[PDB]
């Protein structure tokens, strides 16, 4: 029983397995999947990302070498720099995601066996309807992004068909669009890992609340409590320490990809609206281009949202536990042994909090999204008014 | 006895009832009002806001279709975009306020029965003079805003009278001004809900201070304490947990309207001073327009103030309770049972604080107003100097 | 024995008494001063500030009415607005300082009798050398500012002597320079109130440290401790609550003047360097003007420094007390009664901190000065490069 | 036994001794170095920095007096100001570093004898491989910076060889490059002091974790614990107070140099990329200049990194100790004496944290680097688009 992953979190692992983002071996168990590191998939991931980055660099160099008048996507001087910056930031995100995948997956195996212990202690997990909805949402995001990628690729390939270099665009941007797909899969993988962790934290909060109600190794019954509240509070304190450790492991594993993703999102939310506005004020003459630019703006916003939303939900659960603990304290006999257990839990809550701080650069939550959007508007207002 | 609301908070509920912002049934009790959800008022609110938004969109489209030279309000290219942005942000604020009203009102019924329990425990509320002053202030704000709306509508209708399209302006902006009224009523409703909660918190602080003095279900006497301080401190700890729950419920109910209101306030505090300055530097030729622009700048500032002031007062009360608790700790016998109750209260104060964080985006307080005004000036200085 | 103020804090009270900033009656006691509110000085302050503001407004209107070519100080279009903004912000600062003085002085009497109790408990205060140095520093700042005001007034009066309107400049700027003097005196008064409070906090920290050492109503001996450490820690906890109350009273009394002072400092640190640079790049032709502009830039920086430095020192003392308390905890018998007193003191330190937050807008400390200077440079770089 | 310093921290002390940044006497002990203040080295440092600053000022004045067309480095009007600003900020950094060195070294002796006590208590330190790697890294940074300085000096001396004033560039920039070397040595000295402190904190965390495991004056065995966990926790609480004191001493000693270094880094990260881009867009004609500009951009980034990275590692250790303490609390008998010791340690952790706040202006960590880089990009985008 190496890891025994399952649910919607295990669905993106299979999807990420073919993108180089989860070099694991999946052994069916008719209930879950026993995942372990495979060296063959690690080597495949390494060679795939290396080939994709090499092809992306070669296409970026070739499109520069085609020229300004001959090339369709990058037909200016700032256009060449903006296109190169977009291509390179996407390539760097994909390379960070795939080259760091096997170590990330070992860390995943560790905190996932920890989560298996916690889930055995708490008792079961969410219903199959919730995981089906989560799988549907992940598949919807992936398919929407893939459809956008295919549409944009076909549009730019058909635009160069007038010049006759239709296959040149394919050769120069196939790796770029593959790296886009890889980046999206990496974002979704992190988001669903964080969402499964937040589900565990929600179960912990429910168990603590049931300890509060005191209706009166399978700590929970379904709710109902199968142990005295004093024992339950200590077991839940240990479980919360385990959950904090798992959250820290996830943050350590995804900190560099998360920071690169945030930087890429800032860059794209600056550049895409800029040229979308530039195409509008000067002369449209292209409905498909404007549609694609709006869709890409929404795509970058959705990328930022799927990065920062599970962290916000985790922090919200970490505040709900404090509210529950305060209501716990106001109840129970004053000088009883339950009160001292709740005091230990209070010290735990004050000392450590379950949050995400990728690389220590910032905190992943809603205020970060406000700061990024405030900076994007500041840059856009400065840049647009110059033209 | 469903809810039994009363005071100045219940005055805006009747006013909001006709705007679609409080679909409740009011049953008189000669002392308070027993409010409950009515499906007929919910349907009326839905159809009213839908009709108003449809009319607003139709008028915005028609004014665009009139043209640049023919239309009076939006007679440029950036003017059409600025006018559309203002109209759409007002419509979105009103739609968020009215479409989310019935759920907001159910949450209101819940935390209001909780507040009724708390007020029975503490004992009575503020005098009738205070609620009369609050009603006077709310009515003053509402009537000032309505007078400004009517004046602005009449001014822009008379401006188009020279061209002959006086009724066109009416048809294209009636729904816009109705949505302005709805937005103001929603802001006032939130402000007075928060103010009533802050009044309850002030009563709690007074009770805790009376426990400190120890002059020696009607916990308070008037002040005087009718129970031993040890019992009073535990009852007050429970009451403070209830007040925190009620504050969180209010924040959850109003988070989306509050965020949309703040965004609209930022947009308006950017655009209104910009065109007010533009009219001044180039050529005035219009005293009424400049008067209306200054009045609208003050109106947007007052909107931000009525949003962020009750939250600041609530946070100030939440700090006063900490000061009172510290002075409590320094008194009382050192190893007594009162000291341990005060320690539990200290843990409660450290773990949770009574504040407002709409949607988790930010914190509603004075520093947020400073940040918004700092961003507005940064945008204005950049934009004005370009011209 | 109404208040019994003394030291360098009582020196600025006499100076502020003639500026309308301290309408108190000073009764000598050969050791300190028994200060109390006098209605005659309150009326004198009111009429003086009203007359000064009326004269300032009249001079500002007259200088506008003189014209652009005829007037020397404001000889442009932006110059008239910048001059008016400077004059009006100085007038508003002086009006807030003087109109709010009597209530501020009643609050001062309250927390000063509290401080007298604390100082009797701790034992004496700092030596006469320290208060002499503080008086020398305050007098140096006041005399430097007065010399700058007189020099600037004489320079601008002599500049208009060529046109012949030498007395017009006097008539139009006498009240302006008087209000400058009043603003400086108000800043110094707040700074020395905060400095005396920080001295009391430093004495408290020394007493706590002496409790730590345990060398073994005159709690302190000089150091030495005259009471058992358990009693001393409780008395010091009460004293720290009193000091927190006094700090909050000072912040409440000076919050509006402090916020207006910070806004005026931001405005002046924007406008003075702007025109100093503008005079340099275009054509100097005036050494005295550039010298005065540099001196005014340094003056505004010194204003910000004297506002934010005593608050920083107070916060530094509030951190030193936490360090001392931690070292206290690591010592003493583990389960003794002293440990529980130190635990109560720890709860006090965690719950409340001695700082300054004027009006709740911000926190007065070094980071605020960094934020203000960062905004000033951002505005200056944007504005200067446009020219 | 005055101080007994050793390791990679003692290597930069000898290097800084000849730069005026560590006026100490080194007495060999075959295991460590007994360092003490020497007045001769203090006087040498003072005269050396005074001579270097005098020569730097004279060269800056002479290069201005050469002219615009004749001078090669500063051949414009903004170039003269930018060059003067760079030279003066480097000179100010070097002067702050060297003039404040002897007091900094006395503080170093104090907290270093404290660290010797702590290291005797914990037991030994890291292996010789780690200190050899640290010495290699410091030497690599120093030699890379020296090679860049020599290359840049030779390039600018050879550029003036065409005009014939080859020795004029030497005379005008020798002191400038010497001050650059001094600034780099000061940065490395602070970085390695902070790194040695973080190593001590890591040893403390390991000891606390071993107390957790309870395998069962040489508190640690190697791991293993030679004392009961209750005694070990109290000794570790005292050690953590000592480490906090040492961190505060280091921050006090280096606060002014750190703030000046951060300001210089901001200025250089603004100006160097600006002129690097300006040389690119207009006309390159100079590969060596662009190579040097890119190398200087990377150098300034590395300066910021070596300033802010050891502080980030220290804060990371200070969070790891909280995680370890929480896991400690969840274990151990509930009402035992070990639990109360852990509670005292929790109060210590909550009250004080091991971090760096130079002068109180800001906090040295990763978010500060993000804020600086965000401001640099904002200034660069505004400035570049103007041209
Ligand atoms: O084709 C991909 C892409 O370059 O299309 C253009 C968009 O502006 C950009 O954000 C996006 O990455
Ligand atoms: O008539 C309403 C309105 O458009 O009038 C013009 C003001 O600038 C704007 O803020 C306001 O919403
Ligand atoms: O004479 C006062 C004053 O206007 O002089 C000119 C300075 O720029 C300004 O800061 C100062 O207030
Ligand atoms: O020679 C040193 C220097 O002036 O070279 C030019 C670089 O732009 C600058 O950062 C650097 O300090």
Numbering used by the authors:
A (entry chain A), B (entry chain B), C (entry chain C), D (entry chain D): 14 to 229, 270 to 275, 281 to 445
Article sentences:
Insects, instead, rely on a distinct family of sweet gustatory receptors, which are tetrameric ligand-gated cation channels. An extreme example of sugar specialization occurs in a conserved subfamily of gustatory receptors founded by Drosophila melanogaster Gr43a (DmGr43a), whose members are selectively activated only by the monosaccharide d-fructose, providing a unique opportunity to investigate how specificity for a single sugar is achieved. Here we investigate the structural basis of sugar discrimination by Gr9 (BmGr9), the silk moth B. mori orthologue of DmGr43a. Our results thus indicate that receptor tuning in BmGr9 arises from two distinct but complementary mechanisms: the stereoelectronic characteristics of the ligand-binding pocket; and the engagement of an allosteric process required to activate the channel.
Consistent with our docking results, our data show that l-sorbose binds BmGr9 with an affinity close to that of d-fructose whereas sucrose did not induce a shift in the tryptophan fluorescence spectrum. We therefore determined the structure of BmGr9 in a third gating state bound to a non-activating sugar, l-sorbose, but with a closed pore. As other hexoses are predicted to make many of the same contacts as d-fructose, it is unclear why they do not activate BmGr9. d-Fructose and l-sorbose differ by the chirality of a single hydroxyl group at the C5 position. In l-sorbose, the inverted stereochemistry of C5 places a hydroxyl group in the middle of the hydrophobic patch, probably impeding proper engagement of the aromatic bridge and preventing binding being transduced to pore opening. To test our hypothesis, we determined the structure of BmGr9 in the presence of a saturating amount of l-sorbose to a nominal resolution of 2.6 Å. l-Sorbose exists predominantly in a six-membered ring conformation (about 98% α-l-sorbopyranose), whose single hydroxymethyl arm matches the asymmetric density for the bound ligand well. In the pocket, l-sorbose makes many of the same interactions as d-fructose: a hydrophobic surface (hydrogens of C1 and C3) faces Trp354 and the hydroxyl groups are all coordinated. However, l-sorbose does not interact with Phe333 of the aromatic bridge; therefore, there is no link between l-sorbose in the binding pocket and the pore helix, leaving the ion-conducting pore in a closed conformation. This structure, with a bound ligand but closed pore, illustrates how the structural changes associated with ligand binding may be uncoupled from those leading to channel activation. Indeed, our structure of BmGr9 bound to l-sorbose reveals that non-activating sugars not only can fit into the ligand-binding pocket, but also can make many of the same contacts as d-fructose, yet the pore is closed.
